[PDB]
Amino acid sequence: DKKYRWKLAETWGPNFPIFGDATKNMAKMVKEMSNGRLTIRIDSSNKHKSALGIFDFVKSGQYQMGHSASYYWKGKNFNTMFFTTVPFGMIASEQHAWFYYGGGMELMKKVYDQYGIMSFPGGNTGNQMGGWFKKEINSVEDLKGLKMRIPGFAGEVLAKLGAKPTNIPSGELYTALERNTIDALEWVGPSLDLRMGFHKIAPYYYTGWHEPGTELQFMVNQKAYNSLPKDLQKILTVAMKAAAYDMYSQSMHASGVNLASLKKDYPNVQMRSFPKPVMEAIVQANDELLEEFAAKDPMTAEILKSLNDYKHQIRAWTNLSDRAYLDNF
Amino acid sequence: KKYRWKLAETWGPNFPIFGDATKNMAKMVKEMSNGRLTIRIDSSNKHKSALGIFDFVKSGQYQMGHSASYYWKGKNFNTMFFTTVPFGMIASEQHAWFYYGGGMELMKKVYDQYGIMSFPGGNTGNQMGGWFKKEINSVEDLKGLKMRIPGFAGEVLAKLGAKPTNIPSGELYTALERNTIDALEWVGPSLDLRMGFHKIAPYYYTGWHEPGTELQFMVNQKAYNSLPKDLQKILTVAMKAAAYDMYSQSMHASGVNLASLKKDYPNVQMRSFPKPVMEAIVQANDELLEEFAAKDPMTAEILKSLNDYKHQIRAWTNLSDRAYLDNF
Ligand SMILES: [Ca+2]
Ligand SMILES: [Ca+2]
Ligand SMILES: [Cl-]
């Protein structure tokens, strides 16, 4: 008899490629698979006016669903950071193993259940670039007072070294950089960074370290989910899984297409790496901070131990398999 | 209302990972469809024809199969390319190629002539070079080497004097114990341990030949067309989600089993093919590919797609994950 009409709030602006494709793809799959019994309207930042309001929208049930990143909610609960990615952590293929087979989904459920929110993988970008900089980073002294848009745990790490991170939303990044409200920023990589224009005013494009395997997030209000019949519940969860996996393939695809153009069409972009002493300080600050976060909360210790042990185990296989292969051929 | 389908799979019963992919798909379809589509899975113990899947599905005796596309290379050489290629793409790259790079559509052009629909069926990731009784120190050690190895790699190693040999799977261990073969490859730590090859072959080589083995679901086209559109989408989305989950599971099982291997099997010795040998295999591979491409237009089209795409995507893999792994 009954049809369900839901709405999804997403962080991204309207027609945002790749990220906005995952939500649309998800919604279309649900509509088709349900023969119209479950339909999901997508509201982008231009509609709901709150790019970073998604967690509150879904908790309250004003929206039944959201699409965002777990690490945006660090202010609400620092344990939300670790389900997105961590500096020096796992690459995408590893993190998927961790989520679906290494206990990651279950840890995420223990963190989010307290809010009456269900959280699911919402798409991986793969390994992200270090970002866009107006001036080169030559020593740790260059990080002091550096105003940089960078989320999650890397933001905390750079702050420990004297930087001033912020979490300005995608639609506001260019203007903030143009005005020197930030001196640098990171977003994703070649899949998405070029159309956003940062290259016009920040010519140094740094390689990564901080976001090896960024997974986005779908969120679903538990009470809304419970109201669904069981077959539509499954349709929803399988659609989100499929859309999320495909987003990693799209991120890979787009990164290749866009890197090819970058190699040919941007004579003023200069790719850079952090000097060894800078990277050494960052690795250390990361280790120091992980140890500090782990000690102040047993749920944090549990999550970081799972990530750390799991990375140790799976990286050995990555090294024996794909890395050996990519290094050699 | 209620569709009752069967699927025939190459693998024996309760085969971990590969047999999980089909069970996982069937469970997702039953549940999403509220029972309107269910799929019984017959393993090889039941239909008795591990390499009969292609014909089962083509005839419609079974609505679906799960197997590997390169097992059909004897029927049509172009089926090899949708599993994997020596020195080709790793799994994350190959998924991009399938879904955004034109691979699904090429696959369709090949399989449409048989009234079969082929879909990705799960990636194993990068596979080990295999299990060896004697070390491969030079190209001379390949000559006369009897080895179980499928797909294009088998065609390459033959070109170099080896004797790719056919053996079912249940007999892989025995064949190697009986010296019917001198070596073999299967998959990697995820599945090789349960097979006991480490007991008979001390040397375990790293890969080259199957950098991203994608299995396949097959669906009989007429059967597919008999479904209403909502069931059709349930089936295809289920297949996609199960396929992707199998790579996650393969990664997971590999990490687990590599740790177990290192703790429990002391005299498994990790090797890599010396440089002059890989240069020789590389060269044979390329020469041989150019040969097959020149004889068959569909082959040329598929290899140009695969090569152009690999060159593109690999530059990003190198800049992103590879550099990251190398540096940390
Ligand atoms: Ca980022
Ligand atoms: Ca193999
Ligand atoms: Cl918590």
- Tell me whether residues B126 and A322 touch, CB distance under 8 A: yes
| Residues in contact with B284: Cβ distance below 8 Å, sequence separation at least 6, in sequence order | B156, B159, B160
Match domain A1-124+210-268+298-329 to its CATH number in 3.40.830.10, 3.40.190.170, 3.40.47.10, 1.10.3720.10. 3.40.190.170
How long, in residues, is chain A?
A: 329
Answer for the pair B152, B80: CB distance below 8 angstroms, yes or no.
yes
CA of A304 relative to ligand 3 center, distance in Å: 12
- Tell me whether residues A256 and B211 touch, CB distance under 8 A: no
- Tell me whether residues A327 and B326 touch, CB distance under 8 A: yes
* Closest ligand to residue A78's CA: 3
Answer for the pair A173, A196: CB distance below 8 angstroms, yes or no.
yes
CA of B157 relative to ligand 1 center, distance in Å: 44
Instruction: Specify the CATH class of B1-123+209-267+297-328 in words.
Output: alpha beta
Domain spans of chain B, in order of start = 1-123+209-267+297-328, 124-208+268-295
- Tell me whether residues B324 and A97 touch, CB distance under 8 A: no
Answer for the pair B85, B306: CB distance below 8 angstroms, yes or no.
yes
Answer for the pair A252, A126: CB distance below 8 angstroms, yes or no.
yes
Question: What residues pair up with B271 in beta bridges, in sequence order?
Answer: B205
User: For B242, which residue in chain A has the nearest alpha carbon?
Assistant: A242
Q: What is the 3-state secondary structure (H, E, C) of A126-160?
A: CCCCCEEECCCCCCHHHHCCCEEECCHHHHHHHHH
* Closest ligand to residue A150's CA: 1
CA of A115 relative to ligand 3 center, distance in Å: 10
- The alpha carbon dihedral of A42, A45, A48, A50 has a sign of positive
**Superfamily of domain B124-208+268-295 in the CATH hierarchy:** Periplasmic binding protein-like II (3.40.190.10)
Answer for the pair B60, B27: CB distance below 8 angstroms, yes or no.
no
Domain with residues A125-209+269-296, CATH architecture? 3-Layer(aba) Sandwich (3.40)
User: For A251, which residue in chain B has the nearest alpha carbon?
Assistant: B96
Residues in chain A with CB shorter than 8 Å from the CB of B207 are 321, 324-325
Looking at the complex, report in whole angstroms how far the Cα of residue B158 sits from the nearest Cα belonging to chain A: 21
In the numeric block, which tokens belong to residue B291?
């040969």
Which residue numbers of A belong to the known binding site for Ca(2+)? 128, 186-187, 211
B178 labelled binding-site residue? no
User: For A257, which residue in chain B has the nearest alpha carbon?
Assistant: B312
- Tell me whether residues A245 and B249 touch, CB distance under 8 A: no
Looking at the complex, report in whole angstroms how far the Cα of residue A29 sits from the nearest Cα belonging to chain B: 7
| Residues in contact with A129: Cβ distance below 8 Å, sequence separation at least 6, in sequence order | A186, A188, A189, A190, A193, A205, A206, A207, A208
In the numeric block, which tokens belong to residue A258?
């866009």
- Tell me whether residues A323 and B328 touch, CB distance under 8 A: no
In angstroms, the Cα distances linking A313 to A301, A322, B139, B245, B247 are: 18, 15, 34, 19, 16
Q: How far apart, in whole angstroms, are the C-alpha atoms of residue A69 and residue A215?
A: 7
CA of A251 relative to ligand 3 center, distance in Å: 30
Query: Which residues have a beta carbon within 5 Å of ligand 1, which is an ion?
Result: A 128, 186, 211
The experimental method behind these coordinates is X-ray
Q: How far apart, in whole angstroms, are the C-alpha atoms of residue B171 and residue B44?
A: 14
Q: How far apart, in whole angstroms, are the C-alpha atoms of residue B308 and residue B304?
A: 6
Whether A1-124+210-268+298-329 and A125-209+269-296 share one fold: the answer is yes
User: For A34, which residue in chain B has the nearest alpha carbon?
Assistant: B230
Question: How many residue pairs from chains A and B have C-beta atoms closer than 8 A?
Answer: 191
In the numeric block, which tokens belong to residue B176?
């190697």
CA of A213 relative to ligand 1 center, distance in Å: 10
User: For A231, which residue in chain B has the nearest alpha carbon?
Assistant: B32
Task: Report which secondary-structure segment, H or E, holds B44.
Answer: helix B44-47
DSSP B74: T
| Residues in contact with B167: Cβ distance below 8 Å, sequence separation at least 6, in sequence order | B148, B175, B180, B181, B184
Question: Which residue of B319, B322, B327 is the best one to mutate when testing the A interface, meaning the one whose CB has the most A CBs within 10 A?
Answer: B319
Half-sphere exposure of residue B227: CA atoms within 13 angstroms, side-chain side:
23
CA of B107 relative to ligand 2 center, distance in Å: 20
